[PDB]
């Protein structure tokens, strides 16, 4: 009934169409055990949301590089920022692990004990850290505009768009790495080359993807 | 948490602040006086720090203002932060030694009253002399109120005392900051501002020092 | 009830109670009641600020044509230095904004004058102070509440036009209208920019990149220039 | 219940009412060292002595150091003060330590026997009339009596707060001493210099840039 990844093949039992983006895809039954499935749900959402920010960051800075605005390529930005701004790499990295560490550990213990981060232990904040659902921590800090607490159907549709856009961005970031490794150029340089010659400038003629070509 | 004056009109004030202390505007954003035994100690502390700050600010600004005018005397243009190194009749050390002895007697006499109200209202030597029974820690009265003011609107007078003290405590804090930042006396700092207020804000001053 | 798209069904949350309700909430931003209460005030504040800015920028261009509004901050010179002017602005706006905010957080808790006890705003609605702030009302208040929102939504969209026109043409609102009226077929953005699969063409930023002001050098960037058509 | 880690499972041995009566109980014993009540009692005594020694020592390193930095003092750095003091002393270090162990061992033995049996040091006729005061209080590790000259422990409405400040300030001073040792080995300077240097350029002067703490980055 629900569209599946391989039309004609019955959906796995541990996939009942309840989760957003449920197309019955678990060929290696990695999410067969429930608690494991809940963990993987937060994992896909966390991976996907970072990929969406990543992809949008690379695309904008790549546009600024395509035009004459002086934005470094994604694979060269890390060195430009540290060099031009004389920023100490070790300090920045440790600061990140401090901030991410705090946010990740609080998200981790919310998964282990749902609602346990809304006791007021953190500066007396209670409701902003209770969490609505696994991988969906609404409230007034994370959902400042209330889109999750208004129109249940709109919330379900938004969840479908989020997971699908996140899986697309995760595929796009794997594409940005593979294309840079195979071509040595930027992503919007690759799109301009293809658009110029789509039949003669593609992966089949890159001299790397197909070794016998 | 009633209809008494508030530091932020419209806010839910702490219930523990009920308007029994002077200047109760419900201001305890960090919930320090939530515990009653701490609040009891903090009330006296605020009154003591206020009463010394009021005397200090007076004794810091009056001499400076007299200095600006033709008033002549040993101190003259002595900056408050330079008064310690000034040469007096006795060595600083000696004076400090006397100060700590003299204060040990009065502070422990005041402290006795606070721990047991009306326990130190009698002259140890001239036993006959004493303070009127009706007494609250922080308000000894008797020979400490030689003109009878306490008899009149005491609550208003206590609110005027706390208000003037909080402003004095903030003034002294200013003197400390402005002196360490502008490296000059307070009435000089005020003259600089009154000459060109627009171009004499802490923002511009600190920006220049950066 | 008139709607933004004739023949369409408005969002269930958009019944028609609020002024300016033409059933327009495609993203569902106002389906939460407490969120709608904030956005309603935000739309009013944005509207009134934009209406005054669009009026001021047009008048400033007529009275002071030589001065381009975009370059006014650096050009306007007063004896009250930039910092002195800002300090005064900061304190005055902090007070008015907190007073207005507290009205939204606790309605009816800030209608009393804090210096004169004899003066208090009558019971009212958030976004509509009235009282001393409303000495005269020329007509039905409900009708003017529709006029205010409609004239405000147009002004908010005009300002954004003045900004983009300034960065694309380097001219004030009137000077642009005249450029367009001189050659409409060659003055529209379509006649200034064009993106096709083969190539991309965008009008250049006509705003200096940095301004030198009282020995500071203020960064002055164009808006999302990289994504410009 | 305050928790060292909101949402974590508190050990049942730290949720027991007697354990909750202990100051500084934030449910922190990830290694399960105090599961045994008798051990928890010895470790509570051990934590109190470490806290009170660290607070006294750290105060004797920071306070003199700041005063010297100002000028009010000329004390040598904590890691150089032994050599400076023994240089012009009346006794060599070995004699001074021998006398220390004798006097410390005696008072440490009396405290020890008080842990083995609380109130034992009040044994009548054991200390020329002082044994009466040598009996502590109902709370082990809180002798009071002559050790509380101002009788602050006599105010039951302030007892808990006072003990919490002692444990939290003690745990901080214990970590401040470990920091003084680590920073000395990683910097070659004193704790007051380390503070001033970091405050001058915090983004480039830290343990990530010391060339020791993070040998991987
Ligand atoms: C005694 C040992 C002890 C240990 C080992 C931990 C360990 C931890 N606690 Mg915990 N706590 C401990 C005691 C206590 N905690 C708390 C209260 C909490 C709360 C409320 C929370 C934790 C949390 C955490 C975790 C934070 C995760 C992270 O990456 O943080 C590192 C993150 C940082 C931001 C590091 C902090 C700053 C860094 C040390 C450098 C400081 C730089 C500053 C510029 C300092 C400048 C000062 C100047 C300007 C004055 C973590 C595993 C958090 C958690 O994950 O809970 C699930 C959390 O929310 N603890 C209390 C009081 C009740 C404790 C003791 O009394
Ligand atoms: C989160 C993913 C992530 C990825 C995929 C990369 C990828 C890259 N980083 Mg980078 N970084 C990443 C995070 C971060 N970097 C930096 C800071 C820097 C600097 C300062 C530099 C790079 C550099 C580089 C590039 C050179 C190869 C390298 O050393 O890679 C290391 C990373 C990986 C091999 C894998 C990363 C995890 C999967 C490369 C494309 C260099 C560069 O731009 O060269 C021109 C460079 O100099 N990064 C920070 C902040 C501290 C990051 C995260 O916090
Ligand atoms: C609230 C009380 C109080 C305050 C705020 C100050 C503040 C000050 N005293 Mg001072 N004093 C105070 C009480 C007393 N002093 C002195 C005796 C002195 C002397 C003899 C000197 C000062 C000096 C100073 C200034 C230099 C500070 C200093 O030594 O820095 C360095 C030390 C630390 C930061 C610690 C300074 C502004 C000095 C001064 O006037 O310099 C121009 C100075 O020479 N004071 C006595 C004894 C009667 C005091 C109380 O009894
Ligand atoms: C409140 C709205 C407001 C708006 C929309 C503008 C808009 C503008 N100002 Mg103006 N200003 C505003 C208020 C004020 N300005 C000035 C003082 C100036 C000066 C002196 C200058 C401008 C300039 C400009 C123009 C250059 C744009 C630019 O690159 O800015 C980008 C702004 C920055 C990079 C600064 C940081 C961004 C923003 C201020 C952050 C705000 C953060 C929050 C405080 C939180 C521009 C159209 C410049 C000009 O003339 O252009 C040629 C210029 O030199 N303004 C004052 C002082 C009283 C203001 C007070 O409210
Ligand atoms: C917790 C106590 C304690 C600590 C941590 C130190 C630490 C130190 N002492 Mg010191 N001492 C201590 C107690 C004592 N010292 C001395 C007498 C001296 C002298 C005369 C000298 C030192 C010196 C030193 C430093 C050189 C290290 C050393 O000689 O290795 C041995 C150090 C230890 C074994 C300490 C570790 C103790 C352990 C953790 C406790 C169990 C060093 C930082 C030397 C110095 O200052 O060099 C410039 C030096 O010349 N100490 C005496 C007897 C009076 C102590 C009595 O308790
Ligand atoms: C403060 C220095 C600074 C400078 C010199 C620039 C310069 C530039 N930015 Mg910008 N940017 C900045 C800060 C700065 N940025 C900050 C702080 C942010 C976070 C909000 C951004 C976010 C940003 C975005 C999203 C984009 C740019 C883009 C660009 C390029 C197109 C012109 C533009 O300004 O777009 C306008 C974008 C802005 C955010 C303008 C607002 C920035 C002002 C200066 C706030 C600074 C406040 C601070 C107190 C000073 C251009 C070279 C565009 C680009 O990448 O081209 C491909 C682009 O789309 N920037
Ligand atoms: C906490 C309250 C307080 C404290 C601690 C001080 C402390 C001090 N004052 Mg005083 N002063 C105060 C309140 C206070 N003042 C008030 C309320 C006034 C209002 C008149 C003054 C007016 C005043 C003047 C005019 C002068 C001082 C001076 C002094 C300094 C030396 C006084 C002296 O030479 O021997 C003590 C003198 C007697 C006991 C008599 C000294 C540091 C003198 C000074 O610093 O000259 C260098 C000085 O000129 N004070
Ligand atoms: C009632 C206390 C009080 C008063 C009347 C003043 C007055 C003055 N200060 Mg100031 N100051 C104070 C406290 C105070 N200060 C405190 C507590 C500090 C922190 C320690 C400072 C630190 C400070 C610095 C660094 C500087 C000044 C400076 C100044 C002068 C003008 C520049 C300026 O406005 O800077 C800004 C002052 C502040 C932002 C402090 C806020 C004022 C306090 C909090 C009162 C709160 C406002 C309230 C409505 C009361 C108003 C005063 C009342 C009499 C009407 C001016 C005469 C500047 C100067 O020296 O000029 C040459 C200067 O650079 N002050
Ligand atoms: C948000 C509204 C706004 C803002 C930020 C500005 C800002 C500016 N205007 Mg302007 N203006 C506005 C509205 C505004 N105007 C309106 C509505 C009109 C039509 C009446 C004008 C007509 C106008 C002219 C004719 C000129 C300016 C000029 C200027 C520039 C310098 C003059 C100056 O402000 O000196 C100081 C301003 C004053 C001392 C006046 C004080 C403010 C009055 C007296 C109080 C009114 C308070 C009001 C009730 C508050 C609600 C307003 C609302 C926006 C919140 C400056 C950047 C001048 C310029 O372009 O310089 C090159 C200039 O020639 N404006
Ligand atoms: C609880 C828990 C539980 C779970 O289960 C697990 C775990 C985690 C393991 C645990 C934890 C633990 C810890 C953290 C510990 C730490 C400790 C310390 C740091 C101590 C110090 C400690 C420290 C201390 C005592 C200190 C001491 C010091 C002193 C005396 C001083 C001395 C001196 C001075 C004055 C000066 C001179 O010139 C020199 C000298 C001679 C040097």
Automatic annotation (TrEMBL), chain A:
Q: Where does chlorophyll a 12 bind?
A: 138, 162
Q: Name one GO molecular function term.
A: chlorophyll binding
User: Per UniProt, where does chlorophyll a 16 bind?
Assistant: 183, 203, 206
Chain sites annotated for binding chlorophyll a 2:
23-25
User: Which sites bind chlorophyll a 3?
Assistant: 23-25, 44, 167
Protein residues bound to chlorophyll a 5: 47, 104
Q: Where does all-trans-violaxanthin bind?
A: 26, 28, 74
Q: Which residues bind chlorophyll a 6?
A: 47, 104, 107
Gene3D superfamilies noted in UniProt: Chlorophyll a/b binding protein domain
Binding of chlorophyll a 4 occurs at 39, 47
Task: Supply the Pfam families for this chain.
Answer: Chloroa_b-bind (PF00504)
Q: Which GO terms describe its cellular component?
A: chloroplast thylakoid membrane; photosystem I; photosystem II
Q: Where on this chain does chlorophyll a 8 bind?
A: 104, 107
Coiled coil location: none
Q: Which residues bind chlorophyll a 19?
A: 203, 206
Identify the residues that bind chlorophyll a 1: 5, 44, 47, 161-162, 165, 167, 179, 194
Where along the chain is chlorophyll a 17 bound?
194
Q: Which residues bind chlorophyll b 1?
A: 5, 49
Residues binding chlorophyll a 10: 138, 148, 162
Kindly list the positions annotated as binding chlorophyll a 15.
164-165
Function recorded in the entry: The light-harvesting complex (LHC) functions as a light receptor, it captures and delivers excitation energy to photosystems with which it is closely associated.
Q: Which PANTHER family match?
A: CHLOROPHYLL A/B BINDING PROTEIN (PTHR21649)
The entry's protein name is: Chlorophyll a-b binding protein, chloroplastic
- Where does this protein come from, organism-wise? Chlamydomonas reinhardtii
- Upper lineage ranks? Eukaryota, Viridiplantae, Chlorophyta, core chlorophytes, Chlorophyceae
Q: Which gene encodes it?
A: Lhca
Automatic annotation (TrEMBL), chain B:
Sequence positions that bind chlorophyll a 9: 107, 110
* An annotated GO cellular component: photosystem I
- Write out the residues that bind chlorophyll a 6: 49, 107, 110
- Chain sites annotated for binding chlorophyll a 13: 141
Residues binding chlorophyll a 3, per UniProt: 25-27, 46, 166
Locate the residues binding all-trans-violaxanthin: 28, 30, 80
Q: Where is the signal peptide?
A: none
| Residues engaged in binding chlorophyll a 25 | 206
Give the binding site residues for chlorophyll a 18: 178, 202
Kindly list the positions annotated as binding chlorophyll a 20: 193
Query: Which residues does the annotation say bind chlorophyll a 4?
Result: 41, 49, 166
**UniProt-annotated binding residues for chlorophyll b 10:** 123
* Binding, chlorophyll a 23: 202, 205
Which keywords fit this entry according to its UniProt record? Chlorophyll, Chloroplast, Chromophore, Membrane, Photosynthesis, Photosystem I, Photosystem II, Plastid, Thylakoid, Transmembrane, Transmembrane helix
Question: Which compartments is it annotated to reside in?
Answer: Plastid, Chloroplast thylakoid membrane
Transmembrane domains' residue ranges: 52-76, 88-106
Residue numbers binding chlorophyll a 10: 123
Protein residues bound to chlorophyll a 14: 141, 161
Describe the task this protein carries out. The light-harvesting complex (LHC) functions as a light receptor, it captures and delivers excitation energy to photosystems with which it is closely associated.
Family from the record: Belongs to the light-harvesting chlorophyll a/b-binding (LHC) protein family.
The name this protein carries in UniProt is Chlorophyll a-b binding protein, chloroplastic
Give the species: Chlamydomonas reinhardtii (Chlamydomonas smithii)
Q: Recite the lineage of the species.
A: Eukaryota, Viridiplantae, Chlorophyta, core chlorophytes, Chlorophyceae
Gene name in the database record: LhcI-1
Counting on the full-length protein, the chain here runs from 55 to 264 of 264
From TrEMBL, chain C:
Q: Where does chlorophyll a 30 bind?
A: 224-225
Q: Does the keyword Thylakoid apply?
A: yes
Q: Which domain of life is it from?
A: Eukaryota
Please list the residues that bind chlorophyll b 9: 195
Query: Which positions in this protein are listed as binding chlorophyll a 14?
Result: 97, 100
Summarize where chlorophyll a 17 binds, as residue positions: 130, 148
Q: What residues bind chlorophyll a 5, as annotated?
A: 22-24, 43, 153
Residues engaged in binding chlorophyll a 16: 130, 148
Q: What residues does chlorophyll a 23 bind to? A: 180
UniProt binding sites for chlorophyll a 25? 189, 192
Which sites bind chlorophyll a 26?
Answer: 195
Record's GO cellular component terms = chloroplast thylakoid membrane; photosystem I; photosystem II
Residues annotated as binding chlorophyll a 15 are 113
Sites binding chlorophyll a 8 sit at: 42, 46, 97, 100
Q: Where does chlorophyll a 4 bind?
A: 22-24, 43, 153
Q: Where does chlorophyll a 12 bind?
A: 94
Where does the protein end up?
Answer: Plastid, Chloroplast thylakoid membrane
Binding-site residues, all-trans-violaxanthin 1: 25, 27, 60, 69
What residues bind chlorophyll b 5, as annotated?
95, 99, 113
Q: Where does chlorophyll a 19 bind?
A: 147, 151
Q: Does the keyword Plastid apply?
A: yes
Q: Give the residues the record marks as binding chlorophyll a 21.
A: 150-151
The UniProt annotation places chlorophyll a 18 binding at: 130, 148
The entry's protein name is Chlorophyll a-b binding protein, chloroplastic
- Gene that this sequence comes from: LhcI-5
UniProtKB/TrEMBL annotation, chain D:
Q: Gene encoding this polypeptide?
A: LhcI-4
UniProt GO BP: photosynthesis, light harvesting in photosystem I; response to light stimulus
What is the protein name given in its UniProt record?
A: Chlorophyll a-b binding protein, chloroplastic
Listed binding positions for chlorophyll a 8 are 108, 111
Provide a Gene Ontology MF annotation, just one.
chlorophyll binding
List, alphabetically, the InterPro entries matched.
Chloro_AB-bd_pln, Chloroa_b-bind
Name its species. Chlamydomonas reinhardtii
Sequence positions that bind chlorophyll a 1:
4, 47, 50, 165-166, 169, 171, 183, 198
What residues does chlorophyll b 1 bind to?
4, 52
Gene3D superfamilies associated with the record = Chlorophyll a/b binding protein domain
Q: What does this protein do?
A: The light-harvesting complex (LHC) functions as a light receptor, it captures and delivers excitation energy to photosystems with which it is closely associated.
